[PDB]
Amino acid sequence: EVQLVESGGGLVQPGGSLRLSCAASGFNVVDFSLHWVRQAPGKGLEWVAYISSSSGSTSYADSVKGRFTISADTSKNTAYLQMNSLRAEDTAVYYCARWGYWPGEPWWKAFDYWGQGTLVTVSSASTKGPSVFPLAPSSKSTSGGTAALGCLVKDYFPEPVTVSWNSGALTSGVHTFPAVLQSSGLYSLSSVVTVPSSSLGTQTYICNVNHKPSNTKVDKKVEPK
Amino acid sequence: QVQLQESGGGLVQPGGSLRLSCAASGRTISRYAMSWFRQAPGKEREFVAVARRSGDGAFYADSVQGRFTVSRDDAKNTVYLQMNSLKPEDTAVYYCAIDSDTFYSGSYDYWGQGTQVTVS
Amino acid sequence: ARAELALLSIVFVAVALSNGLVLAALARRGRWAPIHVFIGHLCLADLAVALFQVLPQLAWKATDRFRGPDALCRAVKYLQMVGMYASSYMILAMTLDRHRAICRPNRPVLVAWAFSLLLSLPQLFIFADCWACFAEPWGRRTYVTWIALMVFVAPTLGIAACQVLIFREIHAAAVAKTVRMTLVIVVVYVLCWAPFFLVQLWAAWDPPFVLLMLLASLNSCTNPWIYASFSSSVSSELRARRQLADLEDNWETLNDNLKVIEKADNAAQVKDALTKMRAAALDAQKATPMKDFRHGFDILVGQIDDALKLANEGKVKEAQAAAEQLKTTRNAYIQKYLRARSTL
Amino acid sequence: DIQMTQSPSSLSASVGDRVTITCRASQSVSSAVAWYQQKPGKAPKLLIYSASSLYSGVPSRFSGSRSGTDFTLTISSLQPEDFATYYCQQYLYYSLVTFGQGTKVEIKRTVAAPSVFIFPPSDEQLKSGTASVVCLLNNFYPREAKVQWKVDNALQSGNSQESVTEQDSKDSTYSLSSTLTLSKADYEKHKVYACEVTHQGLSSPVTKSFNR
Ligand SMILES: Cc1ccccc1C(=O)Nc1ccc(C(=O)N2CCC[C@@H](O)c3cc(Cl)ccc32)c(C)c1
């Protein structure tokens, strides 16, 4: 089989520089033009740039014109996208697609094969651990039926965080919401669980927040007031 | 200036069929959403069905799914609710409402008198 | 009877003169392509109808009795049946040949002649003087309906279906001219021969003639005359569409974009015009006027892509110079394939 | 400068249905329109190329059609694997490729009203000078529901952030969490804190409130 892999994605400060790489295996770059496409988190696809290794012709989109530079290296069968002056709107996932050359059927097969893409995020905030707060099961809320507990992590900059309940013993009813980006540049996440109010006083609920970039493990119990 | 009126109703034999109609004057049915609700004399307001804009789809409750059908007519500015295989538990006043929000948020403000549908 | 004989003689003379003139012109010009062969055979069949049918019609009515053995009647009736079969069958063969020609840019004649020869065979048994025999329930009914089905019903229905297919494919212009000529020929044949078959069926199913005889005898001279009037070469000697329209629209769009390019000032206008050029070129390459056609449109698209690259680099004048080669490619191939409208 | 306008921004259907997604080009792009399918967390996969030819490898239930500048993707029979996002893209030239807004195919379900809970800020968080009040909507279908905050019977704007969980694997019902964040001084100057929820499955808005 033939495939395209991507590398060089990561975290840089705004206005910095980063060179994404796209290694194509199984086919030569001199036979296909290589395109870089970008998808913002929660938004649709957007074409960014293209390079024609054979003819040497290259083009960019209006939003990345002048700031990005795409080149090819047929010795390693790789494509390079040097990105400079990365504004806050460049946080996205970048895919490296191939496209055949006119004439023939290869040109009609537009973006037949893609790469898995790399996540490029720009931000001025640094790594810190999350602050865990208990959303308590208020007694007046649906008394005698089923109630909800929660744990809220408010300020943690590296997006991947893990929330578990009772060391993984509680799975039925738990909803872990996607992390939202606050106006302060940090992510906020909430994890709620729906349990019957008859077992509030008997059972104990302890949420575990695991944040590997900060090596922070917080085990916080939630109790009714 | 928006008024809404419903038709149909009455007594239906068990396992029978019926067809109610809801029409609004002073405001176009198109570009809105049309909902049908139930009200039993001893219960609260239950949801029955909703019809969206054109081909966006129609949704029903968990107790009337399959038995009920909602049809729309923007040219006549009306909606139809077809009931099949009725049960004596369906005896209620059926109200018609308009979703004011175009994004289907659920802003029901234009209610109606509703029609009484009873079984046996 | 004198008037009938005079009218038959006049018709025979006119048919013989017309068919002889047409055959002489065709032979003198061909001394070998389609249309010529089918028309020559049709004229030969008309001559056979005149000589072996009209002449016995005059010779029997000269004395109001037949003069000859039983085999003479058998042969003359068989040949008349053969000729009346051959007229319609070779008209059908011509229509099928035209359909074949319009499908893709002589056996059928021999097949039609064989059909005419073999379908007239019972005429060697019916007549035996030559008082025609009859079947026990009814003799005229069975053979009359058989003749109606085989000479008029089935051939006309087949020709109508073939004409429907031809008008489908044409509308999907020498070929159009020949199709119109064949349509006029079959219309004339139907108009001339319908009353005769209708009256013969009525005589069969419902247990005066000379007028319908003359009307049915008019086709044998009308066909060569209408062919001569509808054929330019013979007249001189005697003395698909929708795809084409789409191609024309795409080519005029390409020309308008060329005009925009030549008057363009900046790179954006050149890029937009070339984008329209590429769209039009792809749409035209989709249409079927084919390897050379697609190769030329590939060349056009490649030149458009080169000009687009040059305009992306900001070389507006160089892009216009490169796009000037699109005019050369157009004059090389687009005009050549547009000249195919003369065939159509 | 050529815009592809994918009309249905969201679609709901059950297994076995036939669905149709329509896309429109600003200019004439011939038949150079492709349809891609992307599952969450994965690269897009080419389904349809040349606006009619299905890619070698995809199932035959996908089809494409062209009428002038209107392109149509048709799924004859829905499948559990079919639910994903779909994009139309015109590829008239290398430097002119544009994608559509996308079309997310969901699972049809009966209407379920949300369960509304309200969580006041914790005493641990009040010591940090920031109070966050949470309003949770649980197990509702469809997705379209609105949440507003009435602090002292006054609506709020620009201080609330909403996060929605995607469709559940078991019951395919959504969950929403609206967090309203204030400073400690702003939190202690008000008494009534409430969140009001409106949904198509609710005849009347549901208000959850507390006093502190
Ligand atoms: C058509 C025409 C044009 C010009 C000159 C003469 C004629 C003409 O009438 N010929 C003619 C007439 C009669 C006959 C003729 O005995 N049979 C044979 C079968 C019995 C009879 O039922 C018949 C009916 C039909 Cl329908 C056709 C032909 C004939 C033949 C073989 C030829």
Side-chain angles (χ1 to χ4, degrees), chain C residues 53 77 80-81 123 127 144 147 193 196 200 213 217:
Chain C
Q53 195 159 181
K77 293 302 181 64
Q80 298 170 354
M81 205 69 53
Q123 298 308 310
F127 300 90
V144 151
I147 287 180
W193 281 83
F196 174 73
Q200 207 92 244
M213 152 93 66
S217 190

Side-chain angles (χ1 to χ4, degrees), chain C residues 49 53 77-81 84 123 126-127 132 143-144 147-148 193 196-197 200-201 209 212-213 216-217:
Chain C
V49 171
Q53 195 159 181
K77 293 302 181 64
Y78 170 65
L79 267 54
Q80 298 170 354
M81 205 69 53
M84 71 178 305
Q123 298 308 310
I126 294 180
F127 300 90
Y143 216 104
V144 151
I147 287 180
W193 281 83
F196 174 73
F197 288 111
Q200 207 92 244
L201 266 294
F209 199 18
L212 277 70
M213 152 93 66
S217 190

Side-chain angles (χ1 to χ4, degrees), chain A residues 181-206:
Chain A
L181 187 65
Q182 295 173 141
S183 183
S184 58
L186 306 108
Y187 292 93
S188 179
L189 180 146
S190 305
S191 178
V192 296
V193 61
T194 310
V195 302
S197 59
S198 60
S199 57
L200 279 182
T202 303
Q203 259 285 357
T204 169
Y205 302 98
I206 310 171

Side-chain angles (χ1 to χ4, degrees), chain C residues 201 203-210 212-213 216-231 240-274:
Chain C
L201 266 294
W205 284 18
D206 188 12
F209 199 18
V210 290
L212 277 70
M213 152 93 66
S217 190
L218 180 134
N219 181 34
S220 188
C221 62
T222 301
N223 278 2
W225 214 347
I226 191 60
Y227 164 74
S229 65
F230 224 85
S231 182
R241 180 159 290 97
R242 267 188 291 269
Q243 297 187 118
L244 288 183
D246 297 351
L247 287 176
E248 167 265 350
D249 289 324
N250 291 320
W251 294 334
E252 76 89 10
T253 302
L254 292 174
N255 299 338
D256 294 354
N257 294 326
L258 267 170
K259 298 172 185 176
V260 173
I261 285 180
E262 302 308 318
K263 314 305 174 300
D265 302 322
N266 54 84
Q269 300 166 334
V270 182
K271 288 179 295 183
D272 174 69
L274 287 161

